[PDB]
Amino acid sequence: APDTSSSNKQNFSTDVIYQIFTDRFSDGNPANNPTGAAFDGTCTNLRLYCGGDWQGIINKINDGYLTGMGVTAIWISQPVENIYSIINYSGVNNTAYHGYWARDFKKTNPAYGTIADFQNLIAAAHAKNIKVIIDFAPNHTSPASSDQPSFAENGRLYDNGTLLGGYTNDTQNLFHHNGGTDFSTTENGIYKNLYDLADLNHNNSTVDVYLKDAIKMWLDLGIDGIRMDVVKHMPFGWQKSFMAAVNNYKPVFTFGEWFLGVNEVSPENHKFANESGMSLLDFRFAQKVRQVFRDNTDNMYGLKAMLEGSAADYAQVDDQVTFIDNHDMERFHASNANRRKLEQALAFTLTSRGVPAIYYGTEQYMSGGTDPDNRARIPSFSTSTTAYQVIQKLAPLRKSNPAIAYGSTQERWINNDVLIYERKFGSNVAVVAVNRNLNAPASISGLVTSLPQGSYNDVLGGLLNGNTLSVGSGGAASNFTLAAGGTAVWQYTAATATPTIGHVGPMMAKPGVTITIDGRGFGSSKGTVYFGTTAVSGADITSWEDTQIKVKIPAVAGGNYNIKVANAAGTASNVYDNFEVLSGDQVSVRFVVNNATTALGQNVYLTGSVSELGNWDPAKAIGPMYNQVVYQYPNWYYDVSVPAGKTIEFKFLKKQGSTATWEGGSNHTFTAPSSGTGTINVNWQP
Ligand SMILES: OC[C@H]1O[C@H](O[C@H]2[C@H](O)[C@@H](O)[C@@H](O[C@H]3[C@H](O)[C@@H](O)[C@H](O)O[C@@H]3CO)O[C@@H]2CO)[C@H](O)[C@@H](O)[C@@H]1O
Ligand SMILES: OC[C@H]1O[C@H](O[C@H]2[C@H](O)[C@@H](O)[C@@H](O)O[C@@H]2CO)[C@H](O)[C@@H](O)[C@@H]1O
Ligand SMILES: OC[C@H]1O[C@H](O[C@H]2[C@H](O)[C@@H](O)[C@@H](O)O[C@@H]2CO)[C@H](O)[C@@H](O)[C@@H]1O
Ligand SMILES: OC[C@H]1O[C@H](O[C@H]2[C@H](O)[C@@H](O)[C@H](O)O[C@@H]2CO)[C@H](O)[C@@H](O)[C@@H]1O
Ligand SMILES: [Ca+2]
Ligand SMILES: [Ca+2]
Ligand SMILES: [Ca+2]
């Protein structure tokens, strides 16, 4: 099948995700609606269930609302069973309509539907070539009070009906009891509760195995992707072992939510996206888009910097899920704002790198402040809004023009209010011009592109006051006026002669797992696939066609490899780097080192005899480790994904910059558990 196929669970760069708050989209089955104080059919009280369910999504998939819009994927509220409690927060009732208060990860939320409903949703979506992404929040269960077990459902956790435990009398230690986080440090936000939500303890073997079994159930139901909740608040090491469990079983596109505020650029964020096994929601992108197109707190130079910067900071910038708003921000469109601002931001997102996500209702110009005002019931299913048409004309380009799905990004013209950028991939080009200035035209002269000579009609058909472009030889465009608020798109597509890799997924797995290599020019006959210097050809290449290769990871030593392919004739393609071959199945192990004194700015790291520990390379050591919550300085700890059942030798390092001080004596040694979790506690050897 082609890279653009709806059965491609490893690549969403050619797709356009429609984010659905299930309860606020469409009530297709009144029978499963909550009752009494937990419900409001007029959806006036935005904190109670309104009725939106899976049958409603099924209906909107079948009657063409999403299809006609160009949406090829949907991201829905967490499907697992939530608590039924109606929490009174300072006189205001609240329900689990949002689905973030899980109680049983192996059951569905009856308000959304039954298992069978979920199955029908998967079938209906797939029958219309629409992938399905589910929210999954393994960080916590639900609101709880340690010294007041009658509050809500005490954050109780069930395993397909069987009670595992609650927050009160947590003798099994299923949850954390370190208080609540103030978000002061990453460590503080990971091992303490988010608000009053019972924080699950992933170092507890029961919780670890439970969650991994849970996701498998959903993978077996046919989901095509996963949206991980508050990933900045779970041990990164455990999450990596979680992604390995997923990828070593049934890999699906996974992205986590790591909030970034205005102007925030986080190296940690980058590292997590580059090494965890999942990508992230592109907040850096979204926040900059808001500044530039919505709030007027930065200009195109800032947008350009974000694009060039993120392209350098993210190893797979193309896996980042972009958006202009969501359920935790005020709607992009302000009631008294010019609608063109939302339209331009939309056009920009749909033609930029990554995986665009559109918050339901955006195409209907929904306005609304912070939660819950941004979660109103969609007021209309009209296909006649300008925003709907914008998405309709641009979303399909991600499928037909690989330059938009996998292309590089280059600024070709710019000033305070104007940005004309170019996307390129093989014999494919797309040029996008945007003028954020709603009252001032822009005279564009000197624009140079990679577009072949000729005349190009605006793909938006002038919908956003775009214009026709005239390109001479050398790709130089002749002078033109870019209208106020003008937005235009010009493109060129043709067959690519040389093998070009535009995407690889998953990016982390053990030998034997099948990965997907997408792009153009691979040819119809099986060629060769390279993992570093290692050549793979023949039978281990399960299937091969011009835009997609399905190949099994060779039994090479664990490590980081460059992926490359060659066609039947032997012509090599570009290199897709940063692929991680695991050393085998993974288990999460907490490493603890005592009496490791340091000077300010100096931190302790972990290094060892397996790639998962950086194979003794200081620059690849795990850390910096923690020393605040679970253990206090001079004791340090860190949860790490390591190969199950392997005997591993390790040591700890004290690093400042790239300068490293090694533990003295002999290597520490231990054997990772075959499954479940583990903890190794040792002393620092001077
Ligand atoms: O590089 C692979 C090896 O990495 C580890 O070796 C560490 C030692 O653990 C560490 O003590 C340090 O050894 C130095 C030693 O302290 C000093 O007396 C001597 O003069 O120089 C040594 C360095 O050459 O640094 C090495 C890394 O170089 C790991 O313990 C080992 O098993 C790996 O084979
Ligand atoms: O002509 C090549 C040149 O094109 C663009 O430069 C623009 C510039 O961005 C505008 O602000 C204005 O000054 O017109 C210039 C073209 O005459 C590219 O930005 C630039 O890098 C490139 O060399
Ligand atoms: O907790 C984070 C913090 O840990 C280390 O700080 C130590 C410091 O090195 C010791 O000399 C002593 O002052 O205790 C501190 C922890 O309370 C890291 O050195 C520091 O960079 C890091 O932020
Ligand atoms: O009860 C606390 C809040 O829980 C949810 O908030 C979600 C948020 O929507 C999601 O994007 C983020 O990743 O996780 C948090 C907590 O799971 C509800 O949406 C809020 O209304 C609640 O106040
Ligand atoms: Ca319903
Ligand atoms: Ca947590
Ligand atoms: Ca890369």
Q: Are residues 528 and 610 in the same domain?
A: no
Crossing angle, helix 340-351 and helix 386-394, to 10 degrees? 10
CA distances from 333 to 359, 366, 372 (A): 12, 7, 16
Cβ atoms 11, 507 nearer than 8 A? no
Q: Are residues 384 and 449 in the same domain?
A: no
Q: Tell me which H or E stretch contains 387.
A: helix 386-394
Q: Are residues 198 and 299 in the same domain?
A: yes
β-partners of residue 143 are 197
Nearest CA to ligand 3 atom 21: 601
- Of 582, 606, 627, the residue at which a domain comes to its end is 582
Dist. CA 515–CA 70, nearest whole Å: 27
Question: Domain of 82: which CATH number?
Answer: 3.20.20.80
Domain that holds residue 540: 496-582
Looking at residue 476, the DSSP 8-state letter turns out to be: B
Q: Is 328 in the pocket of ligand 4 (CB under 6 A)?
A: yes
Q: Tell me how crowded residue 484 is: count the other CB atoms within 10 A of its CB.
A: 16
Q: Are residues 192 and 246 in the same domain?
A: yes
Q: Tell me how crowded residue 330 is: count the other CB atoms within 10 A of its CB.
A: 16
Dist. CA 459–CA 468, nearest whole Å: 9
End-to-end CA distance of the chain: 57
As to burial, measured by CB atoms within 10 angstroms (0-12 exposed, 13-18 middle, 19+ buried), residue 665 is: exposed
Residues 314-317: contacts with CB within 8 Å, 24+ apart?
314/270, 314/273, 314/274, 314/279, 315/273, 315/274, 315/577, 315/578, 316/273, 316/274, 316/279, 316/507, 316/578, 317/353, 317/354
Q: Are residues 32 and 103 in the same domain?
A: yes
Give the number of the atom of ligand 3 that is nearest the alpha carbon of residue 602.
19
β-partners of residue 409 are 423
Picking from 640, 638, 653, the residue whose alpha carbon sits closest to that of residue 596 is: 653
CA distances from 179 to 25, 592, 634 (A): 36, 21, 22
Q: Which two tokens stand for residue 3?
A: 């890279």
Q: What is the distance in A from the centroid of ligand 3 to the CA of 469? A: 59
Dist. CA 93–CA 526, nearest whole Å: 61
Cβ atoms 463, 389 nearer than 8 A? yes
As to burial, measured by CB atoms within 10 angstroms (0-12 exposed, 13-18 middle, 19+ buried), residue 132 is: buried
Cβ atoms 314, 353 nearer than 8 A? no
Picking from 253, 205, 260, the residue whose alpha carbon sits closest to that of residue 228 is: 253
Ion ligand 5 neighbours, Cβ < 5 Å: 27, 29, 32-33, 51, 53
Q: If DSSP states are collapsed to H, E and C, what string results for 224-252?
A: CEEEECCHHHCCHHHHHHHHHHHHCCCCC
Picking from 127, 118, 126, 36, the residue whose alpha carbon sits closest to that of residue 78 is: 118
Cβ atoms 588, 673 nearer than 8 A? no
Crossing angle, helix 115-127 and helix 54-62, to 10 degrees? 20
Q: Which two tokens stand for residue 45?
A: 């009280």
Q: Are residues 439 and 503 in the same domain?
A: no
Question: Domain of 535: which CATH number?
Answer: 2.60.40.10
Cβ atoms 515, 19 nearer than 8 A? no
Question: Domain of 454: which CATH number?
Answer: 2.60.40.1180
Distance of CA 17 to the CA centre of its chain: 11
Q: Which two tokens stand for residue 14?
A: 């050619």
Q: Are residues 578 and 602 in the same domain?
A: no
Cβ atoms 586, 643 nearer than 8 A? yes
β-partners of residue 570 are none
Q: What is the number of domains present in the chain?
A: 4
The binding-site residues of ligand 2, defined as CB within 6 angstroms of any ligand atom, are 411-415, 445-446, 448
Q: Name 679's Cβ contacts closer than 8 Å, sequence gap at least 6.
A: 203, 589, 590, 592
Q: Are residues 603 and 520 in the same domain?
A: no
Residue 19 phi/psi, 5-degree rounding, is -85, 120
CA distances from 41 to 49, 72, 83, 414 (A): 8, 29, 20, 49
Q: Are residues 225 and 130 in the same domain?
A: yes
Smallest-distance ligand from the CA of 31: 5
- Of 400, 434, 469, the residue at which a domain comes to its end is 400
Q: Are residues 601 and 560 in the same domain?
A: no
β-partners of residue 89 are 92
Q: Is 627 in the pocket of ligand 3 (CB under 6 A)?
A: yes
Picking from 71, 84, 190, 81, the residue whose alpha carbon sits closest to that of residue 133 is: 71
β-partners of residue 422 are 410, 431
Q: Name 539's Cβ contacts closer than 8 Å, sequence gap at least 6.
A: none
Q: Are residues 557 and 567 in the same domain?
A: yes
Cβ atoms 610, 604 nearer than 8 A? no
Task: Consult the annotation and say whether 456 binds a ligand.
Answer: no
Dist. CA 315–CA 270, nearest whole Å: 8
Residue 336 phi/psi, 5-degree rounding, is -95, 15
β-partners of residue 443 are 481
Picking from 429, 408, 436, 540, the residue whose alpha carbon sits closest to that of residue 492 is: 429
Query: According to DSSP H, which parts of 521-606 are helical?
Result: none
38: amino acid identity, one letter:
A
- Of 530, 550, 582, the residue at which a domain comes to its end is 582
Query: According to DSSP H, which parts of 221-370 are helical?
Result: 236-247, 267-275, 283-289, 300-313, 340-351
Looking at residue 448, the DSSP 8-state letter turns out to be: B
Q: Are residues 360 and 507 in the same domain?
A: no
Which technique?
Answer: X-ray
Query: According to DSSP H, which parts of 136-264 are helical?
Result: 186-190, 205-220, 236-247
Nearest CA to ligand 2 atom 22: 412
Residue showing tokens 């070593």: 248
Active site residues: 229, 257
Dist. CA 473–CA 75, nearest whole Å: 44
Cβ atoms 420, 494 nearer than 8 A? no
Nearest CA to ligand 1 atom 26: 662
